[PDB]
Tab-separated table of C-alpha atoms and ligand atoms in Angstrom:
chain	number	residue	atom	x	y	z
A	1	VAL	CA	116.946	108.772	91.574
A	2	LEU	CA	115.741	105.928	93.810
A	3	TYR	CA	114.490	104.181	90.672
A	4	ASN	CA	118.106	103.895	89.485
A	5	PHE	CA	119.402	101.976	92.519
A	6	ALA	CA	117.002	99.029	92.713
A	7	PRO	CA	114.822	97.382	90.039
A	8	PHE	CA	111.613	97.801	92.016
A	9	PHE	CA	108.406	98.345	90.093
A	10	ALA	CA	106.751	101.067	92.182
A	11	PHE	CA	106.553	102.708	95.581
A	12	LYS	CA	103.870	101.861	98.134
A	13	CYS	CA	103.412	105.176	99.933
A	14	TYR	CA	100.984	105.736	102.811
A	15	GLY	CA	99.931	109.256	103.737
A	16	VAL	CA	101.820	110.782	100.798
A	17	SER	CA	102.128	110.344	97.059
A	18	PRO	CA	105.519	109.408	95.561
A	19	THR	CA	105.373	112.065	92.842
A	20	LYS	CA	105.040	114.728	95.559
A	21	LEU	CA	108.025	113.514	97.599
A	22	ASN	CA	110.304	116.117	95.992
A	23	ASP	CA	108.063	119.005	97.106
A	24	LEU	CA	108.218	118.363	100.859
A	25	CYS	CA	110.539	118.865	103.816
A	26	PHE	CA	110.881	116.302	106.601
A	27	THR	CA	112.448	116.717	110.026
A	28	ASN	CA	114.113	113.298	109.773
A	29	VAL	CA	113.926	110.276	107.488
A	30	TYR	CA	114.459	106.646	108.477
A	31	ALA	CA	115.469	103.902	106.045
A	32	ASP	CA	114.749	100.419	107.410
A	33	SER	CA	116.161	97.608	105.286
A	34	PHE	CA	115.660	93.852	105.520
A	35	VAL	CA	114.865	90.723	103.498
A	36	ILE	CA	111.620	88.729	103.617
A	37	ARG	CA	109.901	86.402	101.163
A	38	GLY	CA	107.130	87.146	98.705
A	39	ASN	CA	104.245	85.975	100.887
A	40	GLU	CA	105.263	88.366	103.666
A	41	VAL	CA	105.626	91.546	101.588
A	42	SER	CA	101.940	92.279	102.186
A	43	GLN	CA	102.621	92.296	105.940
A	44	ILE	CA	104.838	95.396	105.611
A	45	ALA	CA	101.890	97.772	105.946
A	46	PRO	CA	99.923	99.417	108.776
A	47	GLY	CA	97.345	97.216	110.450
A	48	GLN	CA	98.828	93.881	109.351
A	49	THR	CA	99.294	90.702	111.375
B	1	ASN	CA	52.835	109.492	120.228
B	2	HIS	CA	54.918	111.770	118.006
B	3	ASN	CA	57.754	111.888	120.532
B	4	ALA	CA	57.644	108.123	121.110
B	5	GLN	CA	57.558	107.429	117.369
B	6	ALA	CA	60.531	109.728	116.809
B	7	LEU	CA	62.532	107.857	119.444
B	8	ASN	CA	61.525	104.470	118.012
B	9	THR	CA	62.530	105.556	114.503
B	10	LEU	CA	65.867	106.779	115.850
B	11	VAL	CA	66.397	103.364	117.449
B	12	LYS	CA	65.415	101.455	114.304
B	13	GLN	CA	67.859	103.534	112.246
B	14	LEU	CA	70.663	101.554	113.925
B	15	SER	CA	69.951	98.474	111.785
B	16	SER	CA	70.822	100.242	108.516
B	17	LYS	CA	74.093	99.462	106.763
B	18	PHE	CA	74.318	102.851	104.985
B	19	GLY	CA	76.341	101.107	102.283
B	20	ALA	CA	78.708	99.350	104.686
B	21	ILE	CA	79.194	95.587	104.737
B	22	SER	CA	77.317	95.279	108.039
B	23	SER	CA	75.313	97.412	110.449
B	24	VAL	CA	77.166	95.983	113.476
B	25	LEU	CA	80.437	97.639	114.467
B	26	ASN	CA	81.774	94.483	116.120
B	27	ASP	CA	81.300	92.458	112.929
B	28	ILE	CA	83.133	95.119	110.914
B	29	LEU	CA	85.990	95.166	113.424
B	30	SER	CA	86.241	91.369	113.512
B	31	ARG	CA	86.029	90.739	109.762
B	32	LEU	CA	88.379	93.499	108.558
B	33	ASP	CA	91.808	94.889	109.325
B	34	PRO	CA	91.956	98.359	110.957
B	35	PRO	CA	92.595	100.397	107.774
B	36	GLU	CA	89.743	98.869	105.755
B	37	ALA	CA	87.505	98.744	108.833
B	38	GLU	CA	87.945	102.498	109.274
B	39	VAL	CA	86.095	103.084	105.995
B	40	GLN	CA	83.064	101.023	107.017
B	41	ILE	CA	83.042	102.616	110.468
B	42	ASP	CA	83.137	106.029	108.782
B	43	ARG	CA	80.121	105.100	106.663
B	44	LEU	CA	78.192	103.956	109.739
B	45	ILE	CA	79.213	107.070	111.685
B	46	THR	CA	78.029	109.349	108.886
B	47	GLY	CA	74.700	107.543	108.600
B	48	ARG	CA	73.980	107.575	112.324
B	49	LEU	CA	75.075	111.207	112.629
C	1	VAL	CA	99.735	77.707	106.651
C	2	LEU	CA	98.161	78.231	103.219
C	3	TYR	CA	101.237	80.264	102.281
C	4	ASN	CA	103.336	77.096	102.637
C	5	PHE	CA	101.401	75.013	100.091
C	6	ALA	CA	101.425	77.228	96.996
C	7	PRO	CA	103.804	80.028	95.942
C	8	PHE	CA	101.041	82.593	95.540
C	9	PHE	CA	101.851	86.205	96.301
C	10	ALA	CA	98.732	87.271	98.207
C	11	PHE	CA	95.077	86.564	98.859
C	12	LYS	CA	92.269	88.445	97.122
C	13	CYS	CA	89.555	88.451	99.779
C	14	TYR	CA	86.112	90.013	99.336
C	15	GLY	CA	83.996	90.805	102.380
C	16	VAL	CA	86.772	89.808	104.798
C	17	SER	CA	90.431	90.517	105.404
C	18	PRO	CA	92.957	87.655	105.202
C	19	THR	CA	94.680	88.555	108.471
C	20	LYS	CA	91.333	88.174	110.268
C	21	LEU	CA	90.552	84.736	108.814
C	22	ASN	CA	91.882	83.001	111.942
C	23	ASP	CA	89.473	84.895	114.226
C	24	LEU	CA	86.222	83.728	112.613
C	25	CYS	CA	83.942	80.701	112.504
C	26	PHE	CA	82.168	79.593	109.331
C	27	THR	CA	79.284	77.164	108.949
C	28	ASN	CA	80.902	75.589	105.878
C	29	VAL	CA	83.819	76.350	103.576
C	30	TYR	CA	84.067	75.524	99.874
C	31	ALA	CA	87.346	75.176	97.979
C	32	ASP	CA	86.868	75.451	94.210
C	33	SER	CA	89.988	74.635	92.208
C	34	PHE	CA	90.699	75.003	88.496
C	35	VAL	CA	93.240	76.274	85.957
C	36	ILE	CA	92.861	79.343	83.731
C	37	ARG	CA	95.349	81.638	82.016
C	38	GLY	CA	96.709	84.976	83.146
C	39	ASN	CA	94.284	87.151	81.186
C	40	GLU	CA	91.299	85.445	82.818
C	41	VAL	CA	92.420	85.698	86.458
C	42	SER	CA	90.721	89.095	86.680
C	43	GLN	CA	87.417	87.428	85.752
C	44	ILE	CA	87.409	85.416	89.006
C	45	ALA	CA	85.692	88.204	90.937
C	46	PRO	CA	82.110	89.354	91.594
C	47	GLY	CA	80.507	91.346	88.808
C	48	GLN	CA	82.844	90.175	86.034
C	49	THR	CA	81.987	89.148	82.480
D	1	NAG	C1	127.177	99.868	94.276
D	1	NAG	O1	128.425	100.166	94.913
D	1	NAG	C2	129.569	99.611	94.247
D	1	NAG	C3	130.772	99.947	95.098
D	1	NAG	O2	130.469	99.854	96.483
D	1	NAG	C4	129.665	100.171	92.830
D	1	NAG	O3	130.758	99.557	92.157
D	1	NAG	C5	128.371	99.907	92.073
D	1	NAG	O4	128.416	100.539	90.798
D	1	NAG	C6	127.175	100.437	92.857
D	1	NAG	N1	125.933	100.122	92.169
D	1	NAG	C7	124.905	100.971	92.091
D	1	NAG	C8	123.703	100.482	91.341
D	1	NAG	O5	124.941	102.085	92.606
D	2	NAG	C1	102.354	67.020	98.280
D	2	NAG	O1	102.000	65.650	98.504
D	2	NAG	C2	103.065	64.722	98.249
D	2	NAG	C3	102.491	63.338	98.445
D	2	NAG	O2	101.157	63.257	97.961
D	2	NAG	C4	104.241	65.017	99.174
D	2	NAG	O3	105.316	64.140	98.861
D	2	NAG	C5	104.686	66.465	99.012
D	2	NAG	O4	105.698	66.772	99.965
D	2	NAG	C6	103.506	67.412	99.206
D	2	NAG	N1	103.915	68.788	98.979
D	2	NAG	C7	103.484	69.811	99.724
D	2	NAG	C8	104.009	71.164	99.351
D	2	NAG	O5	102.702	69.651	100.657
């Protein structure tokens, strides 16, 4: 249902595949929300500077 | 001579890229971000192993 | 500062990672500029026809 809340094109999932997210259990989930600009979207990823 | 040649061949194997961008770990670490660099380091590790 | 001059979304770097570009020295740099259309942007890459 996350696709119904925001008009984003696709997930960018690391260590897991989005289509499998409904088959798993997690101890806790954290949703971190903010606003950046287009150039900086690539910096939201492991190993970025 | 056989033992010395084996050791010399083992030393000279360190100059092989094994499909990586470079045969030097420091160059790989400096020219790439950690996630991409891990792949090249894995290739070098497999070759040297 | 290249992100401040043009509204491009991200680099497409081959053989190097953009975030590491500030940690390197190059003998010379070449900037080749032109205009194509959207279909042909994928042809600006090694091994394309
Ligand atoms: C967002 O919440 C508002 C009320 O807070 C509601 O009227 C609106 O329909 C909601 N939109 C979506 C996409 O859920
Ligand atoms: C481009 O150069 C012009 C003058 O040649 C200047 O007025 C303008 O601010 C510059 N724009 C950028 C984004 O550097």
